[PDB]
């Protein structure tokens, strides 16, 4: 159903992207950048500007329109928090295969409703909200991550954070390994794509030979991921998975920046997440500075270098 749309996560050179809230400050700024990176940003939408252009690209009144006219298969949203949920819903309505919602601040209840909608359809895959987006290095960048630090390669990266993901990407390029696909699923408690969604893609992607999973306190997506890897990444051909879980020193009961990073009612602590992943054979880098070197050693041990 919805799990079917998991494939839409693997953006590539053929992905045609439209920016919702195109003429807004964020949409405009990141759109110029997507353009320069080489993303196939083919237009955007904003109500009332259909038939106009912005940054030399066509604008359409509705996502429906933009999609039909441009053949866009992906949409990105930078719209302010109060209006972001409706933007997601519009993309889901227009059946955009992939929607990336960067916007931080969407009320959790709005996301609970968007999730209700999302799970009862199989056309639209949502990445986000509150996330940096997704990037297939050298092929397609949708979001706000710095393109230059990414180098097409062999590591699939899925992470609940933004900048900590950048460290990991950087580390992997410094050890010369590169990334196959990087998906920031965001720091919100309710979102459109979880770790398992990405792991599934990574496990079956020939170009992904190793995986880095970056997590943090709050929720139990890390635990679910561990359960998933225990079942699906066992066997002679298992891919090495390396992880770092942030918040080992986080105090209980405090939102740690991200809306979803909180240890509440005794649940969501980092240690348990690390333990769970370890039992699933994931090599957990105790230091966030050593993800690149840990995964490199794993490739090395398996003579995959």
């Amino acid at each position: 159903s919805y799990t079917a749309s998991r494939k839409h996560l693997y953006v590539d050179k053929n992905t045609k992207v439209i920016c919702q809230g195109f003429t807004g400050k964020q949409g405009t700024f990141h759109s110029q950048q997507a353009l320069e990176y080489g993303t196939n940003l083919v237009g955007g939408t904003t109500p009332g500007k259909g038939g106009k252009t912005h940054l030399g690209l066509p604008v359409f009144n509705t996502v429906k329109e933009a999609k039909e006219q441009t053949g866009a298969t992906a949409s990105v949203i930078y719209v302010p928090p109060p209006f972001a949920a409706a933007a997601i819903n519009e993309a889901i309505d227009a059946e955009v295969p992939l929607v990336v919602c960067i916007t931080e601040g969407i009320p959790q209840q709005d996301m609970v409703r968007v999730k209700h909608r999302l799970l009862r359809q199989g056309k639209t895959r949502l990445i986000g909200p509150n996330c940096p987006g997704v990037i297939n290095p050298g092929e397609c960048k949708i979001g706000i991550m710095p393109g230059h630090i990414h180098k097409k390669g062999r590591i699939g990266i899925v992470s609940r954070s933004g900048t900590l993901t950048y460290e990991a990407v950087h580390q992997t390029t410094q050890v010369g390994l590169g990334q196959s696909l990087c998906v920031g699923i965001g720091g919100d408690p309710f979102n459109g794509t979880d770790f398992t969604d990405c792991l599934e893609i990574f496990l079956n992607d020939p170009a992904t030979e190793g995986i880095i999973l970056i997590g943090e306190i709050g929720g139990n997506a890390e635990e679910n991921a561990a359960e998933f890897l225990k079942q699906h990444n066992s066997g002679p051909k298992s891919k090495p998975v390396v992880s770092f879980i942030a918040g080992l020193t986080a105090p209980p009961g405090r939102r740690m920046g991200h809306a979803g990073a909180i240890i509440a009612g005794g649940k969501g602590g980092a240690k348990e997440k690390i333990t769970a992943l370890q039992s699933a054979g994931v090599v957990v880098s105790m230091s966030p500075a050593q993800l690149g070197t840990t995964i490199y050693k794993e490739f090395e041990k398996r003579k995959m270098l």
Partner: protein, 393 residues
Amino acid sequence: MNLQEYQSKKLMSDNGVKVQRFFVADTANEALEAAKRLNAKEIVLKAQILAGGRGKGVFSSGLKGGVHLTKDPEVVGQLAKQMIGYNLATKQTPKEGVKVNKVMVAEALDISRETYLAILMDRSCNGPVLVGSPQGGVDIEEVAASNPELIFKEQIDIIEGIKDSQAQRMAENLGFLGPLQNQAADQIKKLYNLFLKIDATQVEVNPFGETPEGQVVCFDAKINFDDNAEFRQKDIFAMDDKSENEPIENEAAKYDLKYIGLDGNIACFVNGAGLAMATCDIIFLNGGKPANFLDLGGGVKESQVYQAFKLLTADPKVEAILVNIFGGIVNCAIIANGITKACRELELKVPLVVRLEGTNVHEAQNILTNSGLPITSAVDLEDAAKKAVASVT
């Protein structure tokens, strides 16, 4: 965000949920007079702080227990005098407790039955979930641990809303008998509806009780409001003091800086929540004690840098500052210039370790270099960590 118990109880009361009659007081005399006004058989006096466990907490005044029952208005006054102005420490506050400025004087009711009831956006099943147990008055975690069986849940379909059947079912599972089931179901429905109305991520009632007289009453409530919903919960967030906030944290917030104090001497500030957590973590892993978590957000302003610095050096406990920034949107140079500029304007007194990476990084490093300031620039995060720890040994 959490509001004080008296604020949460009024919201519930305003929304048809049954609570105990009460008045709020900020002085011992006012508590004494409120107790007389209640004209009740028995009065419950409760220190008002956000942390739970008040019932077993201790005050810096020597008083034990943050929740007391007494039949005498004068005792209410005497107890209150040992509360207002003092610090209440509980298993959920730090040892130096929290200052109590207000107390609730409510009408105590006899409790015939105590059950646990909560409504939360459950991260395990992407929707509101009714969580309940006939074993109330205790920590839900313990019941979960000891008797997972006594825990009941009803997943609610956000679009449909709570169904009569779910409410009735939960009412039965909580142990309310026939004549009261309906009353309990109704309250559960009103609680669910209130939960939604106010953008709560959690409404927890423990005990969700029964009195000998046949009244279904929410004796204690904790409501966690979704901070992301402030724009549409103006009136609710206006009630938030920020008074229990460690001062440093409130100053920081003013400048879109998310600070979380920890117990340590190595301060740090990073852009991005995961990185910020990872930064406190790596300090700890290298034998240091991070003084705080601080996320700058995504749009670093030399202002922020400056305030971040002003605020952290404000704290005497801080013996060193680790700055870990990974530049992208805002290139590292603008950042280095902010670092240097603040260094000059504040005359930093503790050692500073800076680790920048990302966009226009080289230039930024030249900035730090050409600045002539005693700023240790680290090779990477690990290095930044060992060096910052080295600084306070």
